[PDB]
Design a protein around this nucleic acid. Structure first.
Ligand code: CA
Ligand code: CA
Length: 287
DNA sequence: GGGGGCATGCAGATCCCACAGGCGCG
DNA sequence: CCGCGCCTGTGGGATCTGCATGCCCC
């Protein structure tokens, strides 16, 4: 049990969060929800988040996945209050804005009159993946292509939570095809759907390093932010997350990541014994 | 008396994670 | 040569997202 920084929580919500508006039947029932599902290894984050918001239920989905679900109405107010003070950054903010106007419709109790569900389906048709086939056949009169959020990084604490979700620290070992000497390469990467390309591109100027790699438009719908130059990693990337602590197993991956960075800064990665530890400081992180 | 809210399942779709290899450059 | 690191390319599963349903209560 502990509490995390609010900007770190918002950043992690931009990565793994999901806003849900369920409309099922003609007695149409409604269900507003915020959900996060992770691997069992990161059950601490969900309990860390639940202790911060004092809401939600943490269940087990299968033998490997935990889930945190907030479904009560009065308990969705603290979520909306929090996100109003710490706004989301990715295109998920658009789903949150539709999540909020769906809440105010259900708060005025108008969501049960015939006028209410007609707007909520109109609201639902714009968030996440839209409506189903049946309700789209039950409301082929849906009107309303929402305004696209385009923000930059608000701060580094948002990045700590965001990196704890979609980020990645890992070690590269390359056997030189000419020298047969083991090469060690540290790299930091964040992947993301191309719908937030402007946000991912703003990481370059805010961190002072990194590159954006895309691939052709026909074969891929997600890009990568990546830092491979060791000097940028040791002097820019590492101090950022030393100040803004990551959460979950990403903190453990980052700690082992920094152990390799220091073995390299001490030039011990050229030694036979130093190369042995780095190899273990690579199997550590797969487990 | 039953309607709407809550808790609690289960499952599909995909956007991630954690890499690999070729090769130009200083 | 040689190590660095830009640059292209990716398998597979942890994710994001959706549907269902019996129970409870007021
Ligand atoms: Ca994400
Ligand atoms: Ca993750």
């Amino acid at each position: 049990r502990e509490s995390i920084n609010p900007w770190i929580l918002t950043g992690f919500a931009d990565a793994e969060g999901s806003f849900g508006l369920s409309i099922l039947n003609a007695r149409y029932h409604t269900r507003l929800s915020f959900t996060i599902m992770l691997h069992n290894k990161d059950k601490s984050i969900l309990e860390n988040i639940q202790s911060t918001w004092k809401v939600g239920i943490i269940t087990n989905n299968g033998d490997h996945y935990v889930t945190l679900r907030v479904t009560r109405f009065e308990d969705l107010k603290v979520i909306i209050d929090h996100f109003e003070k710490y706004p989301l950054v990715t295109q998920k903010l658009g789903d949150y804005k539709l999540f909020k106007q769906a809440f105010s419709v259900m708060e005025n109790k108008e969501h049960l009159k015939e006028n209410g569900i007609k707007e909520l389906v109109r609201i639902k048709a714009k968030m996440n993946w839209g409506l189903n086939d049946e309700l789209k056949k039950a409301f082929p009169e849906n009107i309303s292509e929402r305004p696209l959020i385009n923000k930059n990084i608000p701060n580094f604490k948002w990045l700590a939570g965001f990196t704890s979700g979609d980020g990645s620290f890992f070690v590269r070992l390359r056997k030189s095809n000419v020298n047969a000497r083991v090469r060690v390469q540290l790299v930091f990467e964040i992947s993301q759907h191309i719908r937030d390309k402007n946000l991912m591109n703003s990481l370059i100027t805010y961190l002072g390093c990194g590159h954006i790699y895309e691939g052709n438009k026909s074969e891929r719908s997600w890009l990568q932010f990546r830092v491979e130059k060791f000097s940028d990693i040791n002097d820019k990337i590492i101090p950022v997350f030393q100040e803004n602590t990551l959460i979950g197993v990403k903190l453990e991956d980052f700690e082992d990541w920094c152990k390799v960075a220091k073995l390299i800064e001490e030039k011990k990665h050229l030694t036979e014994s130093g190369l042995d530890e780095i190899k273990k400081i690579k199997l550590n992180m797969n487990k």
